[PDB]
Amino acid sequence: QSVGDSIFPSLGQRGLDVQHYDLHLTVPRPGEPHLSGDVTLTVGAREPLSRIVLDLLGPRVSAAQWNGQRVRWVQTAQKVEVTLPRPLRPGETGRLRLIYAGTPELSGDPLPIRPGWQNEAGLSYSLSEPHGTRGFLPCNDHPSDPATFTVRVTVPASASAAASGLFTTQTERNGLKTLTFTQRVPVPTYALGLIVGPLERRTAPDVQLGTQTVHRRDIYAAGLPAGTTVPEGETARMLRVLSDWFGPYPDEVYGVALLPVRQLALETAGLTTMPATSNRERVRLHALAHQWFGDQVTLADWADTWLSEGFATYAELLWAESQGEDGQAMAADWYARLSVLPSRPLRATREEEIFDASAYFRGALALHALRLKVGDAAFGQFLHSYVKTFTGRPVSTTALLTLVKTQLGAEAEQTLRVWVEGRTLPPLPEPV
Ligand SMILES: NC(=[NH2+])NCCC[C@H](N)C(=O)O
Ligand code: NA
Ligand SMILES: [Zn+2]
Secondary structure, eight states: OOOOOSSSTTSSOTTEEEEEEEEEEEOSSTTSOOEEEEEEEEEEESSOEEEEEEEOOSOEEEEEEETTEEOEEEEOSSEEEEEEEEEEOTTOOEEEEEEEEEOOOOOOOOOOSOOEEEEETTEEEEEOTTTTGGGTSOBOOSTTSOEEEEEEEEEETTOEEEESSEEEEEEEETTEEEEEEEEEEEEOGGGOOEEEESEEEEEEEEEEETTEEEEEEEEEESSOOTTOOOOTTHHHHHHHHHHHHHOSOSSSEEOEEEESSOOOOBOOTTSEEEEGGGOOHHHHHHHHHTTTBTTTBOBSSGGGTHHHHHHHHHHHHHHHHHTTOOHHHHHHHHHHHHHTSOOOOSSOOSGGGTTSHIIIIIHHHHHHHHHHHHOHHHHHHHHHHHHHHTTTSOBOHHHHHHHHHHHHOHHHHHHHHHHHSOSSOOOOOOOO
């Protein structure tokens, strides 16, 4: 069956655990949606599976293999079903290879954006939150199932490409270039960054977070507006302040891909996809904070988006305080702007809620209430334990409350409960 998401009940396959995607993507003309793909999924399972059912929306599979053998497959309107010769059982892993080509389709909900493979002004790129990656990649398209990625992108020699993960090698043959990237920490499918077109890679000095080293590089697309810049040394300072709050930076590199398109930013892994119209300090910090909350700590259900958006938004207040600003004052402007609009319990119930004003600011103010309740020292240690508790394990609002009660006490749990439940907006959290 499907994963059973409360918001998108048809996505994914229950019990499937994709561990790695080995993707060879070819884009013949950047800016045009057509492409071809060759992917090998290394998959495990949490329950016996007699079939592998992946989300795919657009392209047409031409061949399928399981452990190097011919395999039975069929492609429905939104899925590819692969009948295995014997069931995949917990503890086992197999290699599913799918050959496909065609045109990715954007998923609907007119959601702030139609997610999927984007094409505009000589650029083709992924902006796939929540469920757009299935457009160009046969995948278990649900954040409950993060995975590692190895991406081989083949584009004309006149163009270039950039995907999440460390840049390894580039080869050229018959007017085509192939670039290889290795995303070596598991992230959700929508966090797979992929951009092809006129792109320039720009390295920066390595950042050192204690004993961890974080490589630095940004992507600069052509035709950026005036003032589309990343200030020198800013990313290093953000990494320092954030990792001191949340724990080690989960990836090996970080930067932004500045695109001359008009869209909202997306926290694609280790390489934030950043349209110029969203390039702001708070957004650059927000997207970086998501590398912990969203990419490393992933959602068990799309209803709990406030665990990603509320946490990343509160990191903007943490960064503001680090830079000498009044955090309580910032929380007051959040409350004032929420006062005017409707509120809801933090568990979303329908599609239009998962990215509304309460996912961001009521979720952030929920953490403010907890922080003022327990103290900055206890709050900081909690965020560290929260990241570690939910690394390699999808997070839920219910599981968060349990961890708060376990670590911070039942009283703190009750304080968070006030903000997690109830339709009306509680009073502005203030220091007692
Ligand atoms: N406007 C939106 N709700 N966009 C979807 C979220 C995009 C991205 N995850 C962010 O941090 O903003
Ligand atoms: Na996985
Ligand atoms: Zn966000």
